[PDB]
Design a protein around this ligand. Sequence first.
Ligand SMILES: Cc1cc2c(cc1C)N(C[C@H](O)[C@H](O)[C@H](O)COP(=O)(O)O)c1[nH]c(=O)[nH]c(=O)c1N2
Ligand SMILES: Cc1cc2c(cc1C)N(C[C@H](O)[C@H](O)[C@H](O)COP(=O)(O)O)c1[nH]c(=O)[nH]c(=O)c1N2
Ligand SMILES: Cc1cc2c(cc1C)N(C[C@H](O)[C@H](O)[C@H](O)COP(=O)(O)O)c1[nH]c(=O)[nH]c(=O)c1N2
Ligand SMILES: Cc1cc2c(cc1C)N(C[C@H](O)[C@H](O)[C@H](O)COP(=O)(O)O)c1[nH]c(=O)[nH]c(=O)c1N2
Ligand SMILES: Cc1cc2c(cc1C)N(C[C@H](O)[C@H](O)[C@H](O)COP(=O)(O)O)c1[nH]c(=O)[nH]c(=O)c1N2
Ligand SMILES: Cc1cc2c(cc1C)N(C[C@H](O)[C@H](O)[C@H](O)COP(=O)(O)O)c1[nH]c(=O)[nH]c(=O)c1N2
Ligand SMILES: Cc1cc2c(cc1C)N(C[C@H](O)[C@H](O)[C@H](O)COP(=O)(O)O)c1[nH]c(=O)[nH]c(=O)c1N2
Ligand SMILES: Cc1cc2c(cc1C)N(C[C@H](O)[C@H](O)[C@H](O)COP(=O)(O)O)c1[nH]c(=O)[nH]c(=O)c1N2
Ligand SMILES: CC(C)=CCOP(=O)(O)O
Ligand SMILES: CC(C)=CCOP(=O)(O)O
Ligand SMILES: CC(C)=CCOP(=O)(O)O
Ligand SMILES: CC(C)=CCOP(=O)(O)O
Ligand SMILES: CC(C)=CCOP(=O)(O)O
Ligand SMILES: CC(C)=CCOP(=O)(O)O
Ligand SMILES: CC(C)=CCOP(=O)(O)O
Ligand SMILES: CC(C)=CCOP(=O)(O)O
Ligand code: NA
Ligand code: NA
Ligand code: NA
Ligand code: NA
Ligand code: NA
Ligand code: NA
Ligand code: NA
Ligand code: NA
Lengths: 206, 206, 206, 206, 206, 206, 206, 206
Amino acid sequence: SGPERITLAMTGASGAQYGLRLLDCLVQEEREVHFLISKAAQLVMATETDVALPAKPQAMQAFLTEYCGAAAGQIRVFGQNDWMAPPASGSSAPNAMVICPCSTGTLSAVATGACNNLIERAADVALKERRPLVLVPREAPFSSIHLENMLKLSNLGAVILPAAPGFYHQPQSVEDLVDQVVARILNTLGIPQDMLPRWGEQHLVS
Amino acid sequence: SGPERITLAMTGASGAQYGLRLLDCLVQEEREVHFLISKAAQLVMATETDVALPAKPQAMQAFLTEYCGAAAGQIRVFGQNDWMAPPASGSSAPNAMVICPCSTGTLSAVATGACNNLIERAADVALKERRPLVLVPREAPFSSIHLENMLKLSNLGAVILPAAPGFYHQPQSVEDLVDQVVARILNTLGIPQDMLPRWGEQHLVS
Amino acid sequence: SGPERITLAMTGASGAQYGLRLLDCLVQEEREVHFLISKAAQLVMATETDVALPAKPQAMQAFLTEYCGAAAGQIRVFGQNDWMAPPASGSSAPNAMVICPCSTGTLSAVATGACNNLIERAADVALKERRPLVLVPREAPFSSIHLENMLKLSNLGAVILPAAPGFYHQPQSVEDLVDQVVARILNTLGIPQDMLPRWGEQHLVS
Amino acid sequence: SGPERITLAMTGASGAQYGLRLLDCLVQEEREVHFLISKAAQLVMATETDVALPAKPQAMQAFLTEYCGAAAGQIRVFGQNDWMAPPASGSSAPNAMVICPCSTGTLSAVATGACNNLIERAADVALKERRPLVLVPREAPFSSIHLENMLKLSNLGAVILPAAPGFYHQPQSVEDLVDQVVARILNTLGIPQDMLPRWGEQHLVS
Amino acid sequence: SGPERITLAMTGASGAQYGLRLLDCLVQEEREVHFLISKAAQLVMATETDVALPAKPQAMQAFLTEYCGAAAGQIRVFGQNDWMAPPASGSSAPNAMVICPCSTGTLSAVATGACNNLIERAADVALKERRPLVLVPREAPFSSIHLENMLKLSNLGAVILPAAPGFYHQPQSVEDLVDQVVARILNTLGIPQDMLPRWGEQHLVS
Amino acid sequence: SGPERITLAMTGASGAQYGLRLLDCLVQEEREVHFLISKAAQLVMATETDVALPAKPQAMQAFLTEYCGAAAGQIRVFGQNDWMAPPASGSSAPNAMVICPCSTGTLSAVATGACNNLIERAADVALKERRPLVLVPREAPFSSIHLENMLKLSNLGAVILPAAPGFYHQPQSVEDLVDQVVARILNTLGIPQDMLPRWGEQHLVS
Amino acid sequence: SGPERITLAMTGASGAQYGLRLLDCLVQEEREVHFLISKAAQLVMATETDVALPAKPQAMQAFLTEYCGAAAGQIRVFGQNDWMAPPASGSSAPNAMVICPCSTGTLSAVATGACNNLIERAADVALKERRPLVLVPREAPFSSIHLENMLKLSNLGAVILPAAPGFYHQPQSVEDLVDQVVARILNTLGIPQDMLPRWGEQHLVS
Amino acid sequence: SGPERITLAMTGASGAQYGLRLLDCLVQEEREVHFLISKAAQLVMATETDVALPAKPQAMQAFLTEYCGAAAGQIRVFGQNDWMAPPASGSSAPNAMVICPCSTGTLSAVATGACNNLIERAADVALKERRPLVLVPREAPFSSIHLENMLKLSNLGAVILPAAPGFYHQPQSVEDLVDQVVARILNTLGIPQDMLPRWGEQHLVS
Ligand SMILES: Cc1cc2c(cc1C)N(C[C@H](O)[C@H](O)[C@H](O)COP(=O)(O)O)c1[nH]c(=O)[nH]c(=O)c1N2
Ligand SMILES: Cc1cc2c(cc1C)N(C[C@H](O)[C@H](O)[C@H](O)COP(=O)(O)O)c1[nH]c(=O)[nH]c(=O)c1N2
Ligand SMILES: Cc1cc2c(cc1C)N(C[C@H](O)[C@H](O)[C@H](O)COP(=O)(O)O)c1[nH]c(=O)[nH]c(=O)c1N2
Ligand SMILES: Cc1cc2c(cc1C)N(C[C@H](O)[C@H](O)[C@H](O)COP(=O)(O)O)c1[nH]c(=O)[nH]c(=O)c1N2
Ligand SMILES: Cc1cc2c(cc1C)N(C[C@H](O)[C@H](O)[C@H](O)COP(=O)(O)O)c1[nH]c(=O)[nH]c(=O)c1N2
Ligand SMILES: Cc1cc2c(cc1C)N(C[C@H](O)[C@H](O)[C@H](O)COP(=O)(O)O)c1[nH]c(=O)[nH]c(=O)c1N2
Ligand SMILES: Cc1cc2c(cc1C)N(C[C@H](O)[C@H](O)[C@H](O)COP(=O)(O)O)c1[nH]c(=O)[nH]c(=O)c1N2
Ligand SMILES: Cc1cc2c(cc1C)N(C[C@H](O)[C@H](O)[C@H](O)COP(=O)(O)O)c1[nH]c(=O)[nH]c(=O)c1N2
Ligand SMILES: CC(C)=CCOP(=O)(O)O
Ligand SMILES: CC(C)=CCOP(=O)(O)O
Ligand SMILES: CC(C)=CCOP(=O)(O)O
Ligand SMILES: CC(C)=CCOP(=O)(O)O
Ligand SMILES: CC(C)=CCOP(=O)(O)O
Ligand SMILES: CC(C)=CCOP(=O)(O)O
Ligand SMILES: CC(C)=CCOP(=O)(O)O
Ligand SMILES: CC(C)=CCOP(=O)(O)O
Ligand code: NA
Ligand code: NA
Ligand code: NA
Ligand code: NA
Ligand code: NA
Ligand code: NA
Ligand code: NA
Ligand code: NA
């Protein structure tokens, strides 16, 4: 159940832990992941994590395959101007797409249809083919510009899933909060997860 | 610097830790706090925390005074239908107002001008007097209904500050993430805080 | 085929027969039903029917189980402020939701995102998770306020299915008209029904 | 009291019983009725009723006069392109107009101002002269296209009265439900009726 | 001339004197008054006036009958959840409706179609039946939320009559200013009044 | 996979080759096709192709069955006013619908909800039941009227798929370009096709 | 605290007492007042008050200086076409501006940006420099034209403060009601006043 | 007749044949062409054609001059950041501008006024000087983002001419379809062409 292929895009918002954890969970569920990462997102990961991600796609692809324990060919890495990659065309095989985390800059580009890189093209392709598109914005405060861009995409079928974890399962660590958001993303995709239990499932009567 | 009085309202969104931590920081900065809490928010606090908050205003006021080490009269607690409380009238002394956390239900009420309790009246009063109003929504995903309500209030001068903590200062605990959001709220209010350093302050040239 | 679980909410519009008949059909199709009923809807049922529905959830749950011949645990009844019930959280297992009948007051609450009870929260949750939401309004005339609320929800993916039965299968009783509307609801949910035949199915050529 | 002349238009929505019953009630109240019926509505009446309505205006006029026990000249029947009929011009004597039932196609035509037949012209004339116009739509679900057309006309003064009968007077037959809707239409027109009692008229105090 | 029955609703805005004076004038003009009063409005009347209004409908009805010198059955009082009262249904006998004074909270409820009590239902019924609806808001400043709600209702046919008395007849007391507003309300209803003379009636030429 | 039944409508835009090729591909995938064709579309086919299509449904149905090598009953042809055909009612069995090619006139009718023929009714039914609806407009330039109609339908869930073939697979004939568009339509429907390969499927890394 | 200079404009709405009382309070707080008055406002003052205001600026300035006990140069009076006055240019020293009372005609001019006199220019200058602008409309009913103009200005930062006094401090005279509105204006400006006490200031707990 | 100078911009949409054929036709009509081509468009031309276009402007200019048989100086090639080129300034000599083909990314940039390269600046200049601007989008499906951008530009005077060739002149090759679109572009520019005959020119009477 859920999509066989997922386009996972990481952009330069804080919350690089969310994207890496999502990537790992997708691998453990035996999903094929088309991995995209912006230049600013590489800076964020170097600043916020101890993950030393190689810069070029192929070295990055080999590193990520090792980091998550993925099978050969399970993780595909595509550069930011590789228009020959599957996500660049609606004639490609159907993927679900997640931008996690999603910068306000990338949010604006997708909202206006700017196609300045492969992440922005892939999101444009997902909307025109009405394939799943999940944006995980991380920003505070949300300006009216941010909110109008989120509202326009939400009206068009995209899922605006902010990196705003809930506390209703007594989190004990940063990792508990990261897992909580990733579990919502997996729920939204229809992919099984055991980190976030189904609320009230054994609650029969008030 | 910053407001002498703050109306702190807590509603039934997850993230009760944010409101309690904000209340404590406000007390440490020697601010007078008009504390409001919804019935659903009391359920959330009992579920998510080990804080045993008394139910009625006066017992609640004595408890909170002890819990934060506040001076006598520094924390005022007002019931949900006490229209004689200062926040209910624009002729009151000027306060800043924070709803943290802010449920989508309370977000909707403030956006539409529904005045079904003192929290909703106080927010209506803040907007009509153009006094500061900060909403801290905690929800995921954000629906188009949520986004339209946030956008309308943002256009009217309210600050939409989601409970979406950043990771760019290497958080080591849940408490680090809670402090990060509370620090943004204090920054937005113009109240001093030392939990979140000023970004790039010693960065002279690229 | 169709949803395994359905949140059936009844609100204080005339047409209590529609909701009871839908509940019975859902039970006969071996579906799990999370049953919600407003205070005004209880008054409507007492006025319009000879069904003597018990007031509290558990007594109501036992009564409804007997009334429809349902298996144990097949019908769950949840009170109007039971936030621990599954419908209150998007982290719950996926349900389809039907408000039948839907008052103009509940229509307004769902349109604006007011979350004043569990019915209104559950509808808010369904929209944010993009799970099925069917509203069955019963009102005449429709004001512009009613129509704007229906249009906003329809634009957001909700199904506005008014209690306006068709006559194109020669109805002979009130029960025929009630069955006609319930069959449209079941069709909309993707649940099998034999009360409303498939139009023109054996019509080969003009 | 109420209008002396009524333009009654029937279009190809299910619910031909509503229009025939309304026509009969109007005759019993000694009102002059300008009767219009679309080609699709004639098909609906043949399918849904045992009324064998003649096809051409004059034969149709003689039949309807007999069917309702109307006086000579009380019922006028006008063909779909008879621009010499009173409803086609705002310089005519003032009528109230009812489209019952009203197809979504005719609803769309009136909303956009399309004047492709005499029914659509007459409705255009009623709106420009600000004479009463009641639309009785029968459709389920209501699409956003349907709802936008109803909302536009409602904003312009038309009454959107859906064929959604109430059950709060214990209906015992299809005829009770048909009478309920017709009574609302008569109430809206200001014409006396005894089928639907005045709600709460003898209810002095709670 | 003017309406035989008036639904007079009082809500929790300052200006309780306006509603009591209007009620008295309506009684002196031999009109039947369906009186509704919110819980907050009862607090306002106790604070702003020396009128000791009984709390429950029937005691309140007997008191008001004595206070205005009304005939038996001339004043009907209905509780806030009495859905059996005439104002709750459009099938009732036609009334005009006045909300005086009208809180911003009730203004918001009527604008959005929220039907949380009988006052809000009655206003919803008045708009859908296109029966007169006069709102008398008392608030300062008017926020953009207040203004959008007033504008939406004004566009829908409601009369937005603020408690903003004119001074162009040399008022000598608070009672002169209260009478001035009540006279505008009576003028708007088409009910005779002698408190506010017809402007320029004997002004023949400049 | 994909829909078992497809309503294929052809209207009077240039590009009759697209519709005939789509019809053939649907037959080869063993799908049941409900075929509708406008009067203007018949003129276009006679002008642009050597296909001699019979005028009346039944003769047309026999011809099309032979032309595509379809099984008996696989292709159903319905006249433009046959309201007894399945597409005319939402109570019919679920179909996907394609208008290929789609004139600007039919685009306008579907956008406004005009139901002047069975093609326009069927599209209205598809939108209200939220069943797939694909429009293949052929026009140049696109006016603002055309664009507003396409945008409104796109916002409502319809797929606006213009007859604008891509050249990125080195087309060698008109037939290659026709096949390219038909393949996008089949992709959009979820029906297998081998004319348009999946873009970048074997592209592992940049 | 508060602005050192205030542009006080009086226009031809009823409520000349409000403007004169505001002018006096501003003088008592030692503020410099740039006084503007329309031709219609002069007629209103002659009709509604016993103040005999001289017609030309300089005589008017000497009179007003005596009437309020102001220091020399404290009150400046500028004619309606004196473009050399400070309020006519954004390069002037910063003022706050109040139009009290504000006619619907002047409200319309400021909303649309009409600059037909110095009052309208000064308001245009205040909005473009984002300096305080308070409008005190006096009208009843408010039309939709009035409400749209107020809403547009409110959205742009202007304060719409209607002459709608509250009664929650037991007013005993017309002068009490005039003082109540003037006190709100002074509160809005941030200027000290003792006529309207701070609501609930000594209300510690419910 | 028609413009003496044309700014021909090619962007990275499929349909490079359209732009090359248009360029050739413009040369044959003795027009001066200011040629712009994006980096992505160069990739498209290498993929879709056997044209080996040199990368740098001057080598590209010499190649194109030879490829079309143009006179010296007839084709000017300008790099993507050459702000000294005529198209970058509205003070330049008047040109008509065509973007053929036009990517959805460039469509978005022109719609929002983004000026990230000379193609986008030139289009911004054309709109502000109200000089002709023709966009030739090639995409399928058109998303709502695409459609809103096209509609905004169409409303502003730009011609949205999709690469959607007609078939009503019996095309026999890909080249016939390419010529058909190019002929519409030339018609829109007012430049003579003989590839597309004038429809119905010798059709005297029906
Ligand atoms: C360490 C760090 C942290 C952040 C950022 C930067 C850096 C270096 N930036 C700014 C962001 O990277 C910038 O706007 C880029 O232009 C985003 O480009 P992409 O959208 O990734 O192409 C950023 N932007 C944002 O919208 N939300 C955020 O939380 C952050 N946080
Ligand atoms: C433990 C727990 C946790 C949550 C909630 C409930 C409970 C019991 N609720 C639902 C919320 O309380 C409900 O909509 C109330 O109606 C909110 O009422 P107030 O806005 O506080 O008056 C809730 N609502 C929301 O908008 N965001 C959230 O994160 C949560 N989380
Ligand atoms: C017998 C009877 C019948 C009706 C009602 C009431 C009663 C007692 N009410 C009014 C409705 O109950 C009221 O607006 C409630 O506030 C609705 O509350 P909920 O939406 O159920 O919480 C009602 N409301 C509505 O929108 N449509 C209807 O057909 C009816 N009919
Ligand atoms: C028996 C039967 C029943 C119905 C219909 C048809 C038939 C034959 N039609 C379809 C409708 O007649 C069609 O859209 C016509 O084009 C309407 O034309 P007029 O609006 O009457 O000119 C129809 N249309 C609609 O909007 N609501 C309905 O309930 C029905 N029901
Ligand atoms: C003495 C006093 C005076 C006022 C109020 C309160 C009290 C106690 N309230 C607040 C108002 O009562 C509150 O928003 C209630 O929620 C209104 O509820 P109803 O609309 O009456 O159901 C109030 N609200 C408002 O909109 N305008 C006003 O002038 C006042 N004045
Ligand atoms: C040969 C030929 C070619 C075309 C046309 C006509 C003919 C005869 N028409 C015009 C179209 O047929 C006309 O607007 C009809 O009214 C469309 O009616 P339907 O939408 O099919 O009912 C047409 N219309 C359009 O929108 N796009 C097109 O490409 C064409 N091409
Ligand atoms: C005694 C008296 C009283 C009033 C008025 C007039 C007079 C003579 N006028 C009408 C107003 O003066 C007129 O519309 C002028 O054109 C307003 O011009 P200024 O806006 O002052 O330039 C007026 N206008 C308004 O909007 N509200 C009001 O309350 C009054 N009252
Ligand atoms: C072979 C080939 C074919 C296409 C594309 C690419 C490639 C390599 N791209 C994607 C497009 O080039 C991308 O969005 C660029 O960012 C466009 O940049 P410019 O607008 O030319 O600056 C593309 N984009 C689009 O909107 N429509 C199309 O038909 C195509 N086709
Ligand atoms: C890279 C590429 C083939 C882009 C075009 O894809 P599509 O046909 O616009 O979905
Ligand atoms: C409780 C109270 C005095 C409410 C009225 O306040 P305001 O004058 O509307 O700001
Ligand atoms: C009762 C409860 C857990 C509400 C919060 O749910 P969600 O995470 O907002 O979908
Ligand atoms: C048939 C006729 C006279 C139509 C014109 O009427 P009107 O003057 O437009 O109201
Ligand atoms: C209390 C009651 C009968 C509510 C329903 O009234 P209506 O038919 O919706 O006008
Ligand atoms: C031909 C026909 C039954 C039309 C009515 O269908 P629906 O119930 O409006 O979906
Ligand atoms: C009277 C005058 C200088 C008007 C121009 O002022 P501004 O520079 O437009 O603020
Ligand atoms: C390169 C250049 C002169 C840009 C400015 O042109 P314009 O005056 O803005 O039309
Ligand atoms: Na770009
Ligand atoms: Na309320
Ligand atoms: Na609430
Ligand atoms: Na016509
Ligand atoms: Na309600
Ligand atoms: Na029609
Ligand atoms: Na002027
Ligand atoms: Na730029």
